[PDB]
């Protein structure tokens, strides 16, 4: 089953990368961020055979996932909540370098310590899953509120899609960071170590890593294939 996901990830990810990269003109901010995410997930799925330098690139891609997804949400909030003050393609390459740049800052130790790895885990939990999740929650809650006061036939479908995206992200990311937090507290002295539970926690690491792989493989299906614009390009190319 793991090998199937490997091809599924590359296949779907490549289509997203190819469709957007074949555009002959400028790409909107949402389009630019989606392209970065497709590349980010593309690298991670390449790791599958080995995991099932490798670790270092693994971390970079994982954070790229949430942060890029976090970046997508903020632009949607800006475009849909304050649509009157932001009427106008705005280049956003600056932030993409930062998000990829912030992964580099954290990714150095992987190429290169008890306290060092403790700080690594602390930063990972603080700024990799928690803050992005809060950002997504706030932005999409305001988007839902604005749409509920809107008028049209697309509002309901937009609400459904937003809820689906948020729920999928939560249910696919929480199980890994929960185990990471449990292990963090165990190391800090808030819990007790035992032979069986350590192996169970390693298996939990494995299972939640597979779940994250599933999310990375599903990213094309929930952010690209559901949009009207993307399908038109796919039908064109």
Numbering used by the authors: 59 to 110, 126 to 161, 165 to 188, 208 to 332
What does the paper say about this structure?
Chemokine receptors belong to the superfamily of G-protein-coupled receptors (GPCRs) with primary coupling to the Gαi subtype of heterotrimeric G-proteins and β-arrestins (βarrs). In this context, CXCR3 and CXCR7 constitute an interesting receptor pair, wherein CXCR3 couples to both G-proteins and βarrs while CXCR7 lacks any measurable G-protein activation but robustly recruits βarrs upon agonist-stimulation. For example, VUF11418 and VUF10661 have been developed as G-protein-biased and βarr-biased agonists of CXCR349, respectively, while VUF11207 is characterized as a CXCR7 selective agonist in terms of eliciting βarr recruitment and activation. Here, we determine cryo-EM structures of CXCR3 in an Apo-state and in complex with small molecule agonists biased toward G-proteins or βarrs.
In addition, we also purified CXCR3 in the presence of CXCL10 and reconstituted its complex with G-protein followed by cryo-EM structure determination at 3.3 Å. Interestingly superimposition of the Apo-CXCR3 structure with the VUF10661/11418-bound CXCR3 structures reveals an RMSD of <1 Å across the main-chain Cα atoms. A comparison of the Apo-state CXCR3 structure with the inactive state and VUF-bound structures reveals that Phe1824.56 in the Apo-state undergoes a rotation of 135° and points toward the ligand binding pocket, and this rotameric conformation is stabilized by Asn1323.33 and Gln2195.42. In addition, Gln2195.42 makes an ionic contact with Tyr2716.51 and further locks the receptor in the active-like conformation. However, it is not possible to discern at this point whether these features represent receptor activation due to constitutive activity or reflect the stabilization of an active conformation by CXCL10, which has subsequently dissociated from the receptor. Still, there are clear differences in the orthosteric binding pocket, in terms of the positioning of the extracellular side of the transmembrane helices and the conformation of CXCL10-interacting residues. In addition, the side chains of several CXCL10-interacting residues are not well resolved in the Apo-CXCR3 structure, which further corroborates our interpretation regarding the absence of CXCL10 in the orthosteric binding pocket.
